[PDB]
Amino acid sequence: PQITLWKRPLVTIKIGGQLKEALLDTGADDTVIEEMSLPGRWKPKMIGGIGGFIKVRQYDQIIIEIAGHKAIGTVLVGPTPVNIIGRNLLTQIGATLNF
Amino acid sequence: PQITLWKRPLVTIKIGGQLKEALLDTGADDTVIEEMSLPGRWKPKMIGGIGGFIKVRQYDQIIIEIAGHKAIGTVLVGPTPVNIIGRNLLTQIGATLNF
Ligand SMILES: CC(C)CN(C[C@@H](O)[C@H](Cc1ccccc1)NC(=O)O[C@@H]1C[C@@H]2CCO[C@@H]2C1)S(=O)(=O)c1ccc(CO)cc1
Ligand SMILES: [Cl-]
Ligand SMILES: [Cl-]
Ligand SMILES: [Cl-]
Ligand code: NA
Ligand code: NA
Predict the structure, then answer these.
(1) Cβ distance A31 to A64 under 8 Å?
(2) Which atom of ligand 1 is the closest one to the Cα of B30?
């Protein structure tokens, strides 16, 4: 699809068996999801942006379905105000910015 | 252009006669630039990023070039890790996300 930016580019994702809404975010290096359980090992990380930093759990090799497209990669889990699909997964679905 | 996302989508902007680097950020509603002088009056605004809310200075109807495209719109000035071009100006340059 071609998604315009008049509104937030929100899509449906499936992660850990759960359906969520998330933002397709070219400004995010990595994918960040609101607190949930995921299987396997994790390690702590701090990530920062406007307003400062938050502590997250870094889970590697996690599958997400993004608008119907399967991708695998790292997912950070923590107290983000919005679920964010970052570049690490946007690349896997072939997403581009065009103008 | 068609910009892939393996790297940060950094572009050159021109504001106030100065060249700066900025990030094309589809997860940002608004355009946020580091401290600089801009003409005219400003209004207060609070924005909520990943780590919390901050105060910024809102300047309306500012001339800004983005990757060679002309925009005139709202620029927020305040402490951000990098200059970010949000959807308010991404729409003016005709940007869409595609996959
Ligand atoms: C500031 C950027 C360089 C990095 N951000 C991605 C942005 O699109 C970030 C995504 C986001 C975060 C919280 C709430 C809503 C959206 N938008 C952002 O700050 O936009 C600001 C905040 C205001 C609400 C959204 O638009 C307004 C302008 S981020 O801090 O969320 C981030 C930082 C580290 C990682 C890990 O790589 C992922 C995301
Ligand atoms: Cl990854
Ligand atoms: Cl590619
Ligand atoms: Cl605007
Ligand atoms: Na894992
Ligand atoms: Na103004």
Answers:
(1) yes
(2) 28
- Which residues from chain A sit within 8 angstroms of residue B8, using beta carbons? 29, 87
Could you tell me if B91 lies within 8 Å of chain A, comparing CB atoms?
yes
And the tokens for A15? 């992660």
Spelled out in words, what is the top-level CATH class assigned to the domain A1-99?
Answer: mainly beta
For residue A26, give both structure tokens: 């070219």
- In sequence order, the 6+-apart residues with CB closer than 8 A to the CB of B7 are none
Q: What is the resolution of this structure in A?
A: 1.4
Give CA–CA dist A96/B21, Å, rounded. Answer: 20
8 Å CB contact between A87 and B27: no
Domain ranges within chain A, ordered by starting residue: 1-99
Structural contact between residues B92 and B76, judged by C-beta atoms closer than 8 angstroms: no
